[PDB]
Every structure is written in structure tokens, then in C-alpha cells.
């Protein structure tokens, strides 16, 4: 119930079926324009669910106008690289990030692996995964990176 499901596919592309079967600064995004999970990428991938303006979780599947995603609250307090990605209503992949790449691109060649990576980024299927372990701001991060 925490996931926004505003998915218009009038162009009949089929991005919704693959969900069930087999830049800009990260601030606040309106749930009504989101389809599917919202992944924010600290040095590791984190899932963001729908909330109101205070941070209280909502369970309306992103239907109401007040449902938002607090991307800024997920920003690392230490100030490291940060970015979030998601799919919007008409099936396009959106990213946010500072001027590391935009969304999940730690490197212009690498990408943080996460369950819906092939759903948001189909062009990175043939990418090679590298197990990464590093400390960012006093916190250990274990994650995999898909590179060329």
C-alpha cells in the first residue's frame, strides 16, 4: 500500500506487465506522477514509500494529492553522493541528483544494483556486477555495481 501505482500506458508499451510478471535535485516528488517503486541511492539502495508532508506514511497507493516522496530526508547527513530513480506515469525512467551521475550512476560507467534495475534500466542487462564494500560517512555499505 506504500507504493505509488499511477501508471498510464496508453501507448501500449507494456512496462506495467513486467512489473507483475517476468538533472534535478532530489527534493519532493508527487506520488500521482509515479508508477512503481521509488529507489533512493545512498552508497546502497533504499526503498522510499509514500508519505504525507510531515513524513507520516500513507497507504492510499499514491492516489491522493497529499501523497509525496520525501527524497531529501533520505540524503546522507554526511553529504556523500546521492540520487534517486523511479518510473513516472507514462512509463519513463526519472532520476534526481546533484550536478557521480544523476540517479544510481556512482560512475559514468557503473550503476548501483537493485531489484527493479532491469525494470528502470533495461539497457544495463549485459552489465557486469562487482561486489563493493566501502565506508561513507562512518557507515559500512555493502552493494553490487553493474558496470560495462
Amino acid at each position, epitope marked *: 500500500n506504500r507504493t505509488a*501505482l*499511477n501508471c498510464n*500506458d496508453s501507448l501500449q508499451t507494456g512496462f506495467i*506487465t513486467s512489473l*507483475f510478471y517476468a538533472p534535478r535535485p532530489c527534493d519532493v516528488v508527487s506520488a500521482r506522477t509515479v508508477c512503481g517503486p521509488v529507489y533512493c541511492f545512498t552508497p546502497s539502495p533504499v526503498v522510499v514509500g509514500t508519505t504525507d508532508k510531515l513524513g507520516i506514511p500513507t497507504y492510499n*497507493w499514491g*492516489e491522493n494529492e497529499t501523497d509525496v516522496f520525501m527524497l531529501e530526508s533520505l540524503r546522507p547527513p554526511t553529504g556523500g553522493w546521492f540520487g534517486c530513480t523511479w518510473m513516472n*506515469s507514462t512509463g519513463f525512467t526519472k532520476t534526481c541528483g546533484a550536478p557521480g551521475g544523476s540517479g544510481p550512476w556512482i560512475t559514468p560507467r557503473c550503476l548501483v544494483d537493485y531489484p527493479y534495475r532491469l525494470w528502470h534500466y533495461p539497457c544495463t542487462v549485459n552489465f557486469t556486477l562487482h561486489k563493493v564494500r566501502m565506508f561513507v560517512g562512518g557507515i559500512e555499505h555493502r552493494f553490487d555495481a553493474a558496470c560495462n
Partner: antibody
Amino acid sequence: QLLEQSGPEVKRPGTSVKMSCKISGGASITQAMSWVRQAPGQGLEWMGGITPIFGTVNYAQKILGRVTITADEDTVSLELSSLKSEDTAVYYCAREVNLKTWNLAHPNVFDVWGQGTMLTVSS
Amino acid sequence: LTLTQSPSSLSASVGDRVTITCRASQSISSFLNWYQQKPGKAPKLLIYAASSLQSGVPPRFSGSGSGTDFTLTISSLQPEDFATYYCQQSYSTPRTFGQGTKLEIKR
């Protein structure tokens, strides 16, 4: 975009029938689907609907005992048991959608209709 | 909730302005839809959300109303508009339809 329905059926009283409805393309079932029946020379009457994401199913109070609505990847079906002469009607599947927000959790309008499957209950 | 349409039968000429009312036994907010059914064919969506025109529907079709009383308006009747018109509420848990309005054309 387009909906295919199974062919017309003639059934003796007391038996059961299963009517099915397909997307008629390479697509899989995503949106909520509903069944609307129309007796000959009569009005439209909602019987039941299924929501694939929730898996939940609703029915009409008059037929709750003998109707079941099932769905898989590409086919929604409607089964009626203990058929009687009053079940003679045309049976439509209709995709229920939210045209304001396209939210899968709150479908509130039938935007695409199958061309109907006519059932006759007769001995 | 219960939907009652007025009138049940309608007769008008090409170019006439016609209206059809739907009356809900209780408030349905704006979850009212209009459908057009030509003989032998499946119903076709005309107006959703009581007032929003569906993509591809000619602009002479229009809807208005809220709460318990609703209206479908055809600004200039055309021969293709010969059909039966149904209102449908999607507010409560069992979806319901109006009895339907048959629209005959005089010439």
C-alpha cells in the same frame, strides 16, 4: 485496447457455463475487469469484478451463491452454475480504469468493452 | 446506490439539443459515467467523472452535475446518436446502472 470474448453458448437448465475474455494481443492482464450482463431487451446489470493486483473479487448480491470470477495472466473468466432460463443474456467483460490518475488501486470507469457473449438457457 | 434516468424514451430531430438526467438515490460525489449503446453492439464510454469528455468522443456530448442529480447534453443531435444511453455510478462497492434512455430520431 481491444477485448476478445468466447463464443455463444446454449446450456440446459441446471448445468454450468464458463465464459472467458482475452486482451486479443501480446498483452497480459493488468487492470481491473468486470462482467456486465444484459438480458435480451433489458438494461445493463453489474455482476462482478476482479482486481488483479489485489486479487480481490466482488459480486452482485443476487448471484453471490453461483458465480465465480477468475483470472490468470491473459484471461478473465466468469462461471455460472445452476443455470436457469433467466440467465439468458449477453455477457460483457469491461476493463475498469481510472482515467483521472490511472491508479491501479481505484478503478472507477469502464473504458474498453468486449463485444459480448450471448448465453441461452434452454432445454 | 440506485440510479433513475429521465426520460426513459426520447424523440428529437437532427440539430435539436437534447438532455438526459440521472438521479442517484444518495450522493455519489462525481463518480458518474455515461455510456452509449447502439443496437447489437457493446456500450461505448462517452463521459467519465460526470463531466470529463472521453478521448475521441465528439464535442457535442457533454456532462454535468454532482451529488445526486446529473445531466448528459447533446448540443446538436446527429443521425449516429441513435442509441440507448446509460448512466453508471462508481461510488459505492456494487457498481450500478440507470435503466437506460432510448433515443429515437425524427426526420
